[PDB]
Every structure is written in structure tokens, then in C-alpha cells.
């Protein structure tokens, strides 16, 4: 059977922490002219298109331009966030 929907209100960022952290890393890499600046830029681009909350860096593996290394970084940063 066909399901009918009405689009919901323009939602705030579903992933404010990941956006913040990728932005911080992007800015740090840009300031230092580091080769990894593009990694963070590309990840931010795909993350901003994604409408669902992510529970972990591991879950974020489904996103374009989210490599194993970056997903691990997000997992590690998440641990630090709730530890502190």
C-alpha cells in the first residue's frame, strides 16, 4: 500500500557534534596547509546532506567520503565528549 506524507518543518542539524568536530579539524588543517584538509571538507559536504542522527562514527561509514580513519576519529571524540 502507498504511504502518503507531508514534509516536516525544516529541521535543525541532526548531527551538531559531528558538524562541529569536522569543522574544527577542517579549520585546523586549512590553517596549517595540511594535506588532510580535503578529507574534512568532503566529509562535511556529505554529512550536511544527511537528514538522520548518527549514533557513532561507525554508523557514519555509510556516508560518502567517510573513511575508516575518520570514522574512528569520530568514535574517539565521542568517547571523550561523554567521558568529560
Amino acid at each position: 500500500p502507498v504511504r502518503l506524507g507531508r514534509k516536516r518543518p525544516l529541521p535543525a542539524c541532526p548531527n551538531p557534534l559531528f558538524v562541529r568536530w569536522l569543522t574544527e579539524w577542517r579549520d585546523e588543517a586549512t590553517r596549517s596547509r595540511h594535506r588532510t584538509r580535503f578529507v574534512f571538507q568532503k566529509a562535511l559536504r556529505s554529512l550536511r546532506r544527511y537528514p538522520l542522527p548518527l549514533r557513532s562514527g561507525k554508523e557514519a561509514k555509510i556516508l560518502q567520503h567517510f573513511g575508516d580513519g575518520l570514522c574512528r576519529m569520530l568514535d574517539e571524540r565521542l568517547q571523550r565528549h561523554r567521558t568529560s
Binding site: 506524507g5 538522520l52 555509510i62
Partner: protein, 49 residues
């Protein structure tokens, strides 16, 4: 705000599912996973009547 019928993702061809997911920044996944993800996205972004 108009009525949007949810596409029948379960009968979509694999290449089309991939293109739909690309809109949301999502990489190609196993077919069942893609169908479930697109349904999840639709239900989060639309209120069912």
C-alpha cells in the same frame, strides 16, 4: 505543503536506489539496506497521513 506519496523503494532497481541515496550523502549499500535506509529517511522527514 503538498502530499508526497512515498516511492515504493522495495521494487526500485539497484542503480536507482543508489542514485536516491546519493541525494542524502549516502554511499551504495546492499540492496535491502538501501531500501530500509530510504524508508527511514522518508519517515523521519515526512509526517504520514
Amino acid at each position: 505543503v503538498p502530499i508526497t506519496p512515498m516511492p515504493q523503494y522495495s521494487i526500485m532497481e539497484t542503480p536507482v536506489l543508489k542514485k536516491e541515496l546519493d541525494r542524502f550523502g549516502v554511499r551504495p549499500l546492499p540492496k535491502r539496506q538501501m531500501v530500509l535506509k530510504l524508508k527511514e529517511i522518508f519517515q523521519y522527514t515526512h509526517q504520514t497521513l
